[PDB]
Design a binder for these strands. Sequence first.
DNA 1: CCGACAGCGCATCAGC
DNA 2: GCTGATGCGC
DNA 3: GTCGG
Length: 318
Amino acid sequence: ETLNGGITDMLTELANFEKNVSQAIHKYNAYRKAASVIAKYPHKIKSGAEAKKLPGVGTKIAEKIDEFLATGKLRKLEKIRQDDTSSSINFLTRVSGIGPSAARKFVDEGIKTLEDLRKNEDKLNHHQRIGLKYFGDFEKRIPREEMLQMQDIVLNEVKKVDSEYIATVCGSFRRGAESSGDMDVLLTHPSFTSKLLHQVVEQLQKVHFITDTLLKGETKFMGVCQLPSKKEYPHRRIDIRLIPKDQYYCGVLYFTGSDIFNKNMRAHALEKGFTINEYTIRPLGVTGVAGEPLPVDSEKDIFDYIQWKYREPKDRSE
DNA sequence: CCGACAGCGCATCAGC
DNA sequence: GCTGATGCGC
DNA sequence: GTCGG
Ligand code: NA
Ligand code: NA
């Protein structure tokens, strides 16, 4: 963190500007990817040319690094920070439900601060009101100890609805992370293959675990939950996905991550003669044509098809 | 030089 | 009202 | 913004 922290903070701040103000999502992911590869770089960068050797860092970023290492700042960023419009737009996107488009809309109307939002809740949809209500709590990290407690509640209540259910808490948590930003739960049932989600949500609301709802459909749920007290715990964001039984363990593998791990596994699968997405793993023909989905009854089955040794979730960082 | 870069599920918006 | 586009989260 | 056809 003390190695190239100044560079990674710069690229991250540049990433947010492109996403929120410029609305250039591909430039946003470009800076983050660069900020990521520099973070894992075990040396203190001395020049843009050194970082240029890394994948994801091109000419423009190398040029920016050179300026930062010589001046301690970036003229582009300093002018962006002092810009009233850009800073206000970039900040409002921190509210869940407010993206680049809505933030641009609000700032143009004069709505630039968190207080201005509260004075204009008639201009906000349901999601934005909830995001505003739990603004502070949503930016808080969820310690693993609390994630375990949340997991106990979810697994207990899901089983009380129907013992035939299968629930898996994925994300960085399943990889053994010390903290999380949210809770992603994958759900399935033998009767559902390629009104089960409602019953689970209702039960979690019955024990007052789920407090609010952002979106709710037949296969996907996003809302707000909170751990019971005896100091009251912060409200956390929870997502619950209903996945078909024949596509469940492919989904588990997908949402467990990491993003880099999935990229490598998809690459290794292609060399073995298989293709893997979020839903299914299919064999490839001699002309590149994919066949019918392969039977998956376990996460270890997918590793067996591609002749790969089973990777523990804790060892899926890359 | 120039397109890819993940894209799906849900809520809301724009047009008919 | 329906249908498709847009916006947003992940 | 970077990478690769
Ligand atoms: Na490079
Ligand atoms: Na937001």
